[PDB]
Design a binder for this molecule. Structure first.
Ligand SMILES: Cc1ncc(C[n+]2c([C@](O)(CO)[C@@H](O)[C@H](O)[C@H](O)COP(=O)(O)O)sc(CCOP(=O)(O)OP(=O)(O)O)c2C)c(N)n1
Ligand SMILES: Cc1ncc(C[n+]2c([C@](O)(CO)[C@@H](O)[C@H](O)[C@H](O)COP(=O)(O)O)sc(CCOP(=O)(O)OP(=O)(O)O)c2C)c(N)n1
Ligand SMILES: [Ca+2]
Ligand SMILES: [Ca+2]
Lengths: 675, 675
């Protein structure tokens, strides 16, 4: 039949792509081609408009199987061709060895690191539910799309998927339909060696619906019926168990050897001949398959065309919501939204930056509907909920509604990070955030790095940034954390010192379209600074205290800027004149012009950095570094600062030593380099 | 009764400790005091010998509840007193706000970061099973101890605990007995807001046994009976559901407000009077309680005394095993074990450092019985199993035995990291390791940081260290990873360049007693270097190519040392003389004498670093840095190196620019500083 021919075409494209690269993963593509064919025939999508907001989404969580995804995209006429498949895994191609949303048309997210994609799917589904609750009206199903996810045993072993699956079951996300490739093989061999749990019983315990397809190597009727069944269960996410043979059809089917290396040439020949293809030919695309797939595309395009008319009619029937929706689909924030950002003066009271963050959120959430966010069981400590908002919960629970704004992630930092990526991937201008302690952002590193690689504008509200948190002690106090994330490409790491800098950090985080943000915020109170503003802090680094005859410049962040200002006064009594630079975001600073940066960190003067955690990175901006390169301590925070000499006198002593060390030396800006 | 008085004493000590600090967590201590009393009465331990190898172990996974643990330790006469309790959460005390094994007698591991402790308990139990299988004989139960773990809802939400619980169920770890504090309250409020899964059904799906105690606020008979029942189920770990009231007895019992802040003074008064204590008194320890607890200590000490005689008799009956066991309990490796380390010459073939690692393991595993380890589903890629060894599995599976050496962790990096910490915490000189790709060590950051803080000699075999892995692409290629872990205190991060450096890295990792190791290893082949040796590489950094008239020194690691040697030859053709330094471990190097370090990185010569990932940290050792501060690419590895100019010519160009940049300047070693 044509369906059989399509499945064979998909299988053979994937095998031929791996063969051409002499690298990659043929096993899961062979096993999942029937399911991929069946799912894509049920999906609504436009290969010519990858951003249609009411498309169904597909996520390949077992990203190593991406020859399968690329084959589907090529067959359906996305902006990806057979010539791209022939360049699978080759430098600069559109077909990298794991899917990247920045590079691959039709890749909603970046997968490859196991466990992430299913969590991203939870976030796409969460966003769709929130979006639909916000905009849909009687006779106006603006958003009614599904989220389809393929995942394997490896994703099911990764703890992040357990976190997201528990939460998705709690949230009753009925438009999420995941498919487990139950092939009983991972890299080390049979799952009997390490993964003998009853996966189905576990998913039932989370509140998921289950459909089992016992012959997923051939039974596309049952796979399609499983989708229809899942669509009837509107209050539970569904897991479809696809019992498959890894490498189905290969001489080496059912073995770990077919997971991750190219097939032998004679194996590929026998695959072709068994399925009616020419063993001398590679990258065959039977015209019957193209015709069948084109029929489905044409139907989907007519569905989108009708959706566009529904949207036009919605704008007439619901003028206010319709204009808001239009603006969001155009990728624009509300005009002058930033006028809601709080502004402080040096006469205002000292405030912890966690509390300043609460105040920002309480002003901007009412102004910017596409802001949603939550905390990983730290709401009253991170201060991430605006008073008066409703939680995102299924209404059946009585605890919230899908139109709610605030997500109770539970103690699930890693899944929160990956869910945030999915919410961003949904689109519609969502600007979403997640709170935890800075030290526990590290639990989510797998997802955070993917925020950076995927270019998603997600925001971590990362409070309790340092030893300033005090008594909870060294298991809670960051040392390495800023260095880790600053060393990752494409992460803005804001460490605001005061009220105005906190508003600048949020301006950046909400305006972002391609750069994730981490906002490192304090437990302890900090004074409002003389010389700060949103305008200056928006440059990432700025001269706070200008001293034209400086003997030294002190560059600092966050809680250490006030410390530097107090040290400047001690230094004056020692006959040393200092300037102060505040560097709330190193990435934003780095992106300024060379001349602006030199106006902040000029030649001809020693520069000392002060920040109460690792000194890594700081030589970009300073000649000497005063930091904390050991673990912290459990005690009252001011006593910990005194112990480590992060005091006005301790900073002054190191500044004076720095001045002396450079006496008789020629000093050029740390910004200069040989290449 | 005296048991009731003991429970009240524990509760009130914990509340009074929190009150004295005006900081900390009274709720779970109040709820878990009955269970703590019951568990410690069942446990075998010696307060005067915290290292008795056949003790039962206790782990407080909900580490915020540590006022409870400290109260138990004080009551039982560990080296912790009421005076220490009065200094709870105070700088420098023995009673920090979360338990630290380095500081607190009787704290087996460091908890506070949720989810870790239960996983550590899995590792203690894994080690006990392996140890018992290795040493026990008929009439000689050398090891027969249990592992008791308390954990809360937060630990159950963290994905790392799901990973470890799936694995522990697979491994049939019948001497693990965990207790869930089922109090339905976390920081954000009721667990109904975020955590509505059927935990018991989930644990059954992993193959755990369940016992439910419906009134754990009072029913210590049922808690004791649950322990006895768990001990009869020898092939399953047990989860005991303790249904408790958080803050039991408080006016604010059953609320999130009692989780994490001190009780009101009038609340403490009514707690005392209800339980028969003097509301005017704090830190009361009724002598009846001390007497009762001392009886149990005396009995336990007689048990240890008999164990010591069993051990003496074992050494006579099993002379070979007995001597091995003695040596391990003394903390000593086999005499001259390091003679088994492979040694290479520059005439030997190029080898990837993952393969050199395999060869090291295959030589030292037969020589050092206390080495065990595994991989997170990457055994044939990390090359972490010595041929001929047996896997650690329950014999009932037919797949291994508890005497096995090699652990199939599955796709569970975070739990592997925390399990490794538990194996180290067991003691008996275990030197254990875990393989994954370097980029996915990041999934385990929560546990890795605790390896450092806890001072455990665990080892990550972290292959596929760079863009040198090639086609799997940027989701797999580390950039930030070395910087992150090097910026963490107390992590040796070895990046060996060749065969001799790989043997030095293992020498360090196996000899370690207080410092975790990460071995960053290559997929691609590297040449054997002229000038390398175990002796020189053991210094962490050394002069590979000495050039007395150097115009520049190139410092490099791993795969970039050979690149630097090739660049030296290009530079010679340009009239520039270079030296080369190899820096296989920055931490080990930093610990050498100032004079040794200056012999490697002298004054008076520009120094350029070369390493194909982040430049963070490198200014400690260099004036200019050539690194990779952007994500990688999917393609054949040599093409990626060429794209980013990590070629002999690209290094030479930057070296020549560095020489020019310092013409006419006075250059001092990067090792100098102002303070
Ligand atoms: C977070 C995480 N951890 C481990 C992995 C590694 N991994 C993976 C890869 O890195 C690919 O993403 C490797 O396959 C990798 O390409 C090769 O090992 C490279 O070989 P070599 O020639 O360089 O030696 S896949 C994988 C487990 C596969 O188990 P599954 O059951 O999910 O997939 P299956 O049904 O067998 O196809 C596992 C465990 C990952 N992708 N993400
Ligand atoms: C990996 C990880 N993530 C989050 C946490 C945070 N956390 C914790 C702490 O950091 C303590 O370890 C906080 O309590 C912290 O001390 C306060 O929030 C500080 O307050 P503030 O005065 O500074 O505002 S405990 C916790 C959840 C508690 O839920 P559980 O159900 O485990 O404990 P319970 O029965 O309620 O006592 C949670 C979620 C953690 N310890 N580890
Ligand atoms: Ca599989
Ligand atoms: Ca709880």
């Amino acid at each position: 039949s044509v369906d059989q021919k399509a499945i064979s075409t998909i299988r053979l494209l994937a095998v031929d792509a791996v063969a051409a690269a002499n690298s990659g993963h043929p096993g899961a593509p062979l096993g999942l081609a029937p399911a991929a064919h069946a799912v894509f025939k049920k999906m609504r999508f436009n290969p010519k408009d990858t951003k249609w907001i009411n498309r169904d989404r597909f996520v390949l969580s077992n990203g190593h199987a991406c020859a399968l995804l690329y084959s589907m995209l090529v067959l359906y006429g996305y902006d990806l061709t057979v010539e791209d498949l022939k360049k699978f895994r080759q430098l600069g191609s559109k077909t990298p060895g794991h899917p990247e949303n920045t590079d691959v048309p039709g890749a909603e997210v970046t997968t490859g690191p196991l466990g992430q994609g299913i969590c991203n799917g939870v976030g796409i589904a969460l966003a769709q539910a929130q979006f639909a609750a916000t905009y849909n009206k009687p006779d106006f199903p603006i958003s009614d799309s599904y989220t389809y996810v393929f995942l394997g045993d490896g994703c099911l072993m990764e703890g992040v998927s357990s976190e997201a699956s528990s939460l998705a079951g709690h949230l009753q996300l009925g438009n999420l339909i995941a498919f487990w490739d139950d092939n009983k093989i991972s890299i080390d061999g049979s799952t009997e060696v390490a993964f003998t749990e009853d996966v189905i019983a576990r998913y039932k315990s989370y509140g998921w619906h289950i459909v089992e397809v016992s012959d997923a190597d051939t039974d596309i009727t049952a796979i399609a019926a499983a989708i229809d069944e899942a669509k009837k269960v509107t209050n539970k996410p569904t897991l479809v168990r696809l019992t498959t043979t890894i490498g189905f059809g290969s001489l080496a089917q059912g073995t770990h050897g077919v997971h991750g290396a190219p097939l032998k040439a004679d194996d590929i020949k026998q695959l072709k001949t068994k399925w009616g293809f020419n063993p001398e030919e590679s990258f065959a695309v039977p015209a019957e398959v193209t015709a069948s797939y084109n029929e489905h595309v044409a139907e989907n395009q007519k569905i989108q065309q009708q959706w566009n008319e529904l949207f036009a009619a919605y704008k007439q029937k619901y003028p206010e919501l319709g204009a808001e929706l239009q603006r969001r689909l155009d990728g624009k924030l509300p005009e002058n939204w930033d006028k809601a950002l709080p502004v402080y003066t040096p006469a205002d009271a000292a405030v912890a930056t966690r509390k300043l963050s609460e105040i920002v959120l309480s002003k901007i959430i009412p102004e910017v509907p596409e802001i949603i966010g939550g905390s990983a069981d730290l709401t009253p400590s991170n201060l991430t909920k605006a008073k008066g908002t409703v939680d995102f919960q299924p209404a059946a629970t009585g605890l919230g509604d899908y139109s709610g704004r605030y997500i109770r992630y539970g103690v699930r930092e890693h899944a929160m990070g990956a869910i945030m990526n999915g919410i961003a991937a949904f689109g519609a201008n969502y600007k979403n955030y997640g709170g935890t302690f800075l030290n526990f952002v590290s639990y989510a590193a797998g997802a955070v790095r993917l925020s950076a690689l995927s270019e998603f504008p997600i925001t971590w509200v990362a409070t309790h940034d340092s030893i300033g948190l005090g008594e909870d002690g060294p298991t809670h106090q960051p040392i390495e954390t800023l260095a880790h994330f600053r060393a990752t490409p494409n992460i803005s790491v804001w460490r605001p010192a005061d009220g105005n800098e906190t508003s600048a950090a949020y301006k950046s985080a909400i305006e972002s379209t391609h750069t994730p943000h981490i906002l490192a915020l304090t437990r302890q109170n900090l004074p409002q600074l003389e010389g700060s503003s949103i305008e200056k802090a928006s440059k990432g680094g700025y001269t706070l205290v200008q001293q034209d005859k400086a003997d030294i410049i002190i560059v600092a962040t966050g809680s250490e800027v006030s410390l530097a200002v107090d040290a400047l006064k001690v230094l004056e009594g020692q006959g040393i004149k200092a300037g102060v630079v505040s560097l709330p975001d190193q990435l934003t600073f780095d992106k300024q012009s060379e001349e602006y940066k030199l106006s902040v960190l000029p030649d001809g003067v020693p520069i000392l950095s002060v920040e109460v955690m690792s000194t890594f990175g700081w030589s970009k901006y300073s000649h000497q570094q005063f930091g904390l390169n050991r673990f912290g301590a459990s005690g009252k925070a001011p006593e910990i600062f005194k112990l480590f000499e992060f005091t006005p006198e301790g900073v002054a002593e190191r500044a004076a030593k720095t001045v002396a060390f450079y006496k008789g030396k020629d000093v050029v800006s740390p910004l200069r380099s040989a290449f």
